């Protein structure tokens, strides 16, 4: 059982995507997770984008878990250096039919009033009380308090290539971050048992958020654009 | 305890390096693991390069294992597409004071006569009876029959950037291969317990080999050059 999709660019009204909150597809084909007005990113923004169809990560009959690989390119432009950009974007896996969670440092995937399980890879740009120096890549399981973290230097407004790979036989989730214009490479990996934290069917996608009003800073913002995205999963 | 070294280039007669067999440092400073005469790679070649000083990967007293990260760039030029280039290069970890093993598909690290333990990451270009489609990255533990492998497409004569990282806490060995001119990225990882396969002190380095004469093909060859190399390791306590 193999499922896969590829997006070289994005089209307005793409029927295979489910856009939520502020997420929208620009005219020149980029998926803008968070709000940008007249070329300027705004604060108090949150948006998600999910693949329209659910994917099966494991089968309770056979007990088998899927292996998958997804690659995407994103760009984060931070026009206002002072006082601090926020908040970041993530790639996540969650039960189907979920609603956008809290914004800010919760990236829009965590909902305290009614938490749902999730596995996510974050590209965190704002340092909350629970965070190590930013920016950093982090692996999150049911919480934004990462199990593993690695710092990285952002290519402001540049293109970033990401590769996320999960091997069921070893339970290893490894992600690679590359900034071609700088030639830098960042790698992080950890063990995660999907069967143990997620249901048989899930949704995959992205979620991002800009500065929360509580911070009283309109400069706490940046863009969170997704340029392309391909996904592939295999359940034996 | 933290050890590390960085070679942004290679000098003739590198005091910090121990060259074996065909390995040699060119005039323009690249480390040529296998023989190349007048700009042409030859068959029947094998060479290794080890960091002169041994490194401690684990301590029997504390039971602690080290974490490490190594980055290097290499280039493999395949002048003769037919009938098949060979054999590939590897980065390996082995007990100190070992001798070059068999060439060919054994890369010069495996010795059937008297086998010694080793952990290696291979960049295999010839398909032996025990191999999947080539080229591929492979993780080898005491054998060239990889535990895990992933295929990749070579940038002939181009530059390749490699990042190998080992985290003791999870026992995860993850390697990343990138070809900047093509923008391609390959990743592979697996679990390896160093403490369980290697001695407390080891040697780290590279080894490569070209077509073995038994194949009766002088075209079974290619270059195996290392452009730069940095290593780092933290053994807490
Ligand atoms: C942050 O964004 C939210 C969503 O865009 C704002 O809430 C929505 O604001 C609309 C415009 O005023 C209003 O029609 C909607 O009812 C409201 N949604 C609800 C029910 O929460 C949120 O705050 C609102 O908008 C600002 C401009 C003020 O007018 C507030 O009084 C509203 O509640 C935004 N945060 C702020 C206060 O900037
Ligand atoms: C929010 O971003 C603004 C634009 O980046 C900051 O203003 C800019 O501050 C620069 C100083 O580093 C100055 O050269 C620019 O001309 C100015 N641009 C504009 C259009 O405002 C702003 O900084 C605050 O406001 C400015 C006017 C000064 O009073 C600064 O001392 C203030 O810090 C940023 N606000 C914050 C909270 O940092
Ligand atoms: C493959 O490379 C070998 C080097 O590791 C060659 O070994 C030969 O070893 C001899 C013993 O010391 C030495 O005199 C020779 O110079 C050297 N090769 C030559 C001729 O330069 C091996 O050469 C073949 O095998 C040896 C034992 C002799 O019979 C040579 O005449 C053969 O050419 C190389 N094999 C091939 C097929 O080229
Ligand atoms: C070993 O590599 C050689 C160089 O690529 C091959 O020879 C070259 O083959 C080309 C077409 O395949 C031909 O246009 C070139 O002129 C020729 N170059 C030379 C110097 O020979 C060689 O291919 C075969 O063997 C050679 C000797 C010729 O007879 C070719 O016509 C053959 O295809 C490669 N060896 C093999 C067996 O593939
Ligand atoms: C959880 C979350 O969404 N957090 C937001 C938030 O972050 C906090 C920080 O900005 C922090 C730094 O001073 O300030 C907090 O709020 C202030 C508050 O405004 C004051 O009245 C007083 O209570 O002090 C606290 C801090 O101690 C913010 O909640 O905002 C930033 C944007 O600037 C990010 O969006 C975080 O994700
Ligand atoms: C063991 C080793 O290092 N392998 C070399 C070797 O690989 C074999 C293949 O090239 C294979 C292709 O036909 O041929 C083998 O040898 C022949 C032998 O010469 C014949 O007489 C007959 O017995 O069949 C066998 C194989 O069936 C080679 O051992 O050579 C290649 C060079 O192209 C590589 O260097 C491998 O690493
Ligand atoms: Ca954060
Ligand atoms: Ca091989
Ligand atoms: Mn974080
Ligand atoms: Mn192999």
Swiss-Prot record, chain B:
Key word Cell inner membrane present: no
Family designation: Belongs to the leguminous lectin family.
Keyword GTP-binding: no
Protein name: Basic agglutinin
Keywords: Glycoprotein, Lectin
Source species taxonomy: Eukaryota, Viridiplantae, Streptophyta, Embryophyta, Tracheophyta
GO molecular function, one term: carbohydrate binding
Glycosylation: residue positions: 44, 219
Function: Lectin.
Gene coding for it: WBAI
One Pfam family from the record: Lectin_legB
Source organism of this protein record: Psophocarpus tetragonolobus
């Amino acid at each position: 059982k193999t499922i896969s999709f590829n997006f070289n660019q994005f089209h307005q009204n793409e029927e295979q995507l489910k856009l939520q909150r502020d997420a929208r597809i620009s005219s020149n084909s980029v998926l803008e997770l968070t709000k940008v007005v007249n070329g300027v990113p705004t604060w108090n923004s949150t948006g998600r984008a999910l693949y329209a169809k659910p994917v099966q990560v494991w089968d309770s009959t056979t007990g088998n878990v899927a292996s998958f690989e997804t690659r995407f390119s994103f760009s984060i432009r931070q026009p206002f250096p002072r006082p601090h950009p926020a908040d970041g974007l993530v790639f996540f896996i969650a039960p189907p039919n979920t609603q956008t969670g809290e914004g800010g440092g919760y990236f829009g995937i965590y909902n305290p009033l009614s938490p749902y399980p999730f596995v996510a890879v974050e590209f965190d740009t704002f340092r909350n009380t629970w965070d190590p120096q930013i920016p950093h890549i982090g692996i999150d399981v049911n919480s934004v308090i990462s199990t593993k973290t690695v710092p990285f230097t952002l290519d402001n407004g540049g293109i970033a290539n990401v590769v996320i790979k999960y091997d069921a036989s070893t339970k290893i989730l490894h992600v690679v971050l590359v900034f071609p214009s700088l030639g830098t490479i960042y790698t992080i990996a950890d063990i995660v048992d999907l069967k143990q934290v997620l249901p048989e069917s899930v949704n995959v996608g992205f979620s991002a958020a800009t500065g929360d009003p509580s911070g009283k800073q309109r400069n706490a913002t940046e863009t969170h654009d997704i340029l392309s995205w391909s996904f592939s999963a295999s359940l034996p």
